């Protein structure tokens, strides 16, 4: 009650059906709701209390419905953002997020995210987010050898 800090729990409890005790989304549509809510986050906390639900959902219905309702080019607009405003963990959140979801070879030969978090993959100051780049670098070139 009141304003002060900043309360995203508000936006989630509000929606709690949607959510579990693990703090996944329990229905596919729930995941609509989330990416409604994260797409306007005013807020750099509020966004990615939103990523963390993307890294509890388990089934993966959820995760594709994700990408479906273009939460995967919104991961892709925040990406550029938190590399040019020198938000290391806040990109680290994107990236790991991205990774998580399964960005299939369709969706890399789309956006091209390959060639733009290859350049952290090469020589960045983020060891964090580089490694972490290498990772899925590697396992975004295995699924496009093997289909082209």
């Not at 009650?1 to 508000?10: A, L, T, V």
């Not at 996944?24 to 729930?30: F, T």
């Not at 005013?42 to 906390?45: E, L, Q």
């Not at 959902?57 to 419905?65: G, H, I, Q, S």
């Given at each position: ?10 936006l ?19 995941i609509a709701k989330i990416f409604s809510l994260m797409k306007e986050a005013?807020?750099?906390?509020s966004r990615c209390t939103y990523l963390?639900i993307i ?11 994700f990408?479906?309702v273009?939460g995967?080019?919104l991961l892709?607009?925040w ?18 997020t ?51």
């Open positions: 009650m009141g304003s002060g800090p900043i309360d995203p729990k508000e989630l409890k509000g929606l709690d059906s949607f959510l579990t005790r693990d703090g996944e989304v329990k229905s596919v549509d729930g005013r807020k750099m906390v963390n890294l509890q959902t388990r089934a993966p219905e959820v995760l594709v419905k990408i479906d273009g995967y080019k892709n607009s990406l550029t953002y938190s590399k040019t405003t020198n938000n290391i963990p806040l990109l680290q959140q994107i990236l790991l991205l990774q998580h979801l399964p960005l299939t070879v369709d969706h890399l030969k789309q956006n091209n995210t390959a060639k733009l978090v290859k350049q952290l993959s090469k020589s960045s100051e983020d060891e964090e987010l580089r490694k972490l780049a290498s990772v899925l670098v590697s396992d975004w070139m295995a699924v496009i050898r093997s289909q082209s």
